[PDB]
Amino acid sequence: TTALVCDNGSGLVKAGFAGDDAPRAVFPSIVGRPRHQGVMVGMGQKDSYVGDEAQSKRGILTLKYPIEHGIITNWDDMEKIWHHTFYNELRVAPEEHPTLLTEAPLNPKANREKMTQIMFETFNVPAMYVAIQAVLSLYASGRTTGIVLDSGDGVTHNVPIYEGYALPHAIMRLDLAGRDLTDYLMKILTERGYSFVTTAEREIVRDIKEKLCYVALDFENEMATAASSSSLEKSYELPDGQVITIGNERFRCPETLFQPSFIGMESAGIHETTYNSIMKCDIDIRKDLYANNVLSGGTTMYPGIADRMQKEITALAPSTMKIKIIAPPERKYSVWIGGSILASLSTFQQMWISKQEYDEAGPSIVHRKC
Amino acid sequence: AQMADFGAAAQYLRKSEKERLEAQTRPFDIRTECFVPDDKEEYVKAKAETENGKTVTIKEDQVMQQNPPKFDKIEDMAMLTFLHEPAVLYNLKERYAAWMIYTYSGLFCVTVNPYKWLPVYNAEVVAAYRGKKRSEAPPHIFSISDNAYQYMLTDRENQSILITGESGAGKTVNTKRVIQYFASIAAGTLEDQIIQANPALEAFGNAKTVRNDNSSRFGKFIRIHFGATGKLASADIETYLLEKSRVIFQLKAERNYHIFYQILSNKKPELLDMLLVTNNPYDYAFVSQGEVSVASIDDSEELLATDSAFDVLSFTAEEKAGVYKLTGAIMHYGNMKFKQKQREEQAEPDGTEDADKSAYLMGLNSADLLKGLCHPRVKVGNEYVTKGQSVQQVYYSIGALAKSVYEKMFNWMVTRINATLETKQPRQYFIGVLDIAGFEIFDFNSFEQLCINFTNEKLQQFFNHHMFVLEQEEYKKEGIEWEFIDFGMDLQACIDLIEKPMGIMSILEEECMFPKASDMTFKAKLYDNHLGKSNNFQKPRNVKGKQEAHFSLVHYAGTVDYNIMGWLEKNKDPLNETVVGLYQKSSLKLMATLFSTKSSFQTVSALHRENLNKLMTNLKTTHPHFVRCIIPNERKAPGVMDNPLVMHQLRCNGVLEGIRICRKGFPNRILYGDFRQRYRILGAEKLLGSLIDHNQYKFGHTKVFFKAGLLGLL
């Protein structure tokens, strides 16, 4: 029987069947509830809308993400989102499919325990398993060695792997991702006059970010160039007319990934944490880590991020190593692709957590053995 | 008495009583005539002291006591007392010397190609078998066909004919003669119609094999239909799984399907110019891996036979030139060349001449082809995104494209032929004529051989199931209480580890998906999963002087050894849906007709296994009838068979399996009167209450049953 792969993430659910080339259902991980009154008797108003149905009724709803920083902080909303994913998007019965869930490293244990308990009790899955997003990303890249930099909507993390062995002491996790860039853009756009405060307006700004923003190879002279001419200005049209034009915001928004001090964080840029994670590994494997930096997740999709990353790491590393940034053109779904590859392996069918093992051991089965 | 109506053919079908009665009284001893091994014969009579022209003294539990001369020409070895290899071997040798090329084997039908015209088939003077059973007439396959007629008419159930076919000849003539028989019984005929367009199959599904020169690399399952009352209707043929890995990869001293070389014979320059193709085979890789030509056949006459076949078929100018274009384009694929994009990991083209050829041919765009190959695209939810590609992945895509093109073209020609031979009123019943390749044991076994051996394994287990249930029925019939572990399934269910989704081919695909997987890693995983935990899985005995194997399995045809080098290249089939969409729009109308009708994982193993299971379901709903053709000698001279070749054949033909299983009888099942008369030297209750073991027999309803090794005493 086929298995389901349900890469959750903090900004986008990507579900599908193990063995496919791409996720079958990709929709926002969001739950909306109506704010306003409701006057038309008999309209049949629902209590809450999930997914991209909440994205079209966006104007009258208040949107909430049940996942903040890789951590599920609202379990009823997450239950709603899973119920939707199974019954309305995939249109299956969870009682007949093992489920492969995914999670970021270095986040609380209660997260996995509750995932397992929810699945087994209120969905009656026959078996389940909770992988790590970086390992699956490496599976999808088609290699067994490299330091993968995953950057989704909530959390950015590096996992160095060599010959199939993880170095858990060198895993570095950072908590700025797509959503903090969206917020920084909402805040930086006010100095041109545009004011987005609603959650719907936050979605609008996310679209602006995905369409107009890029990473500058050299931030300072790019800034001076934007100050001199006006060849960097582009225009965007909000969904009521009202075109807006942005200038240096285009590259000041994703620059925060390399100078997290723009949002008052103390950490180092993604280039520097990648280099530190490398230099925390054994001196014999870091030459092969230097040449297999695998990029993954949506926040690594800016134009020019691989070039800036390679320039920075090259400036940091010794002048003899070959820095190679591997950025596939479909890296936004690398975790799901790798998860399907994994769940399809024949040698994996003994790694599931059967219902009987759960009934014996409790929800603590998940991290204690698998 | 009942044979002289075959006249001049009676001498062949069943000898007169005189020579037989003088042969049933030969003076032979049970303790001075045994069988011992040999270097040239491997099995010889002898007199431990043994002499027959050569003397050796060996152990006394390896000799085979020769059969009693009471039975020394019986056409069914199911009644002998000493069932062993040389027994059956020399029995067939003798019955073939005194010319009777026909033989019954328990449930099979072993016939031998005589290399000599015989009136044993013509005229109807011999085809008078009408109404008779198999047991009473001389052992002719026409009696088998008549039994099939009777059964299909009396049960309204479809029937099946399974002949062994990898023998070069004997397959052809036997198929012809049986289909002629069926034409006669339920009467520009349908046989003419069949053999008209057969060059199609000969040119598309046949190639020079290292131990052959015209081998069917697919299964031919002819469905010859009958009326509701039993008058022949039109006949539609069905084809099945094809060794399509041959399209790209070929071993040394072999070659892929003829049609390439037939075209390449430089016979009709119109084609070689329409396809912008030269005549040197060493310039197109998908055919120039092994040998470019075999001197045992000319290609011009083959091209002309195929042209004639296209003409007799309903093909137009387009239904011929388009197929030529498809083949030419598959060949121009073979030298598509790509390089990594400078400083980065992406295939980039270098030279597009072949791309121009192919785009013009198939009715495609050169730029569209190149980019869709270099930039695959996926349907992600409700969106489209491009995928990057390494060079090897794109080469995989090219090979898969060529394979799918060839395969669907083949299937469409199959449907075309099935239509061209179909015009008839509504029918109900038919007889299945299943032609299939046989087992393979070469000096260098590879993946395709594993596939074919697994197919034959399934078919042999199927036959064993059939014979098991028929024997169980017969034992229930005479009230003979005897039960046993199912001979049909259990002894072989353990050698299909290859199908269990942890076995050989399963682990093969698992590695195909596993990154950086190597044949060494694959061997490691295999040994982890099966070494020691399986009895059938064993380490090969690589003694210097032969090519190295990597594992050894015990099939029913001995213990086979394989070499796993290059199997990832054989099994991977990541299909590129972008170029599929390109095909589904092409201007070349044949391409569109082929590919008219909320991917990256396809393995040759998967499709092969599913087609095999499909054919198995096709069979298990019917009633089978088996045939065993043998090529007696390689020098094609009549009269004498070379015993080691024929012995290896009969080993792989599986009849020895039937012998081994009937050895678990009671294969000898006699009436009361015959044994009462023949052995009265002193109703059967008193005759066998005199004396041995009392399990040697099972008395029921005037039937005595004997285990092998008992009537050598009588």
Ligand SMILES: Nc1ncnc2c1ncn2[C@@H]1O[C@H](COP(=O)(O)OP(=O)(O)O)[C@@H](O)[C@H]1O
């Ligand atoms: N083309 C793009 N350019 C820049 N940012 C993008 C692009 N596409 C998506 N993003 C960002 O990626 C985030 C979603 O990425 P994703 O990998 O789905 O995260 P998760 O895996 O946590 O759901 C969004 O916050 C969005 O801002």
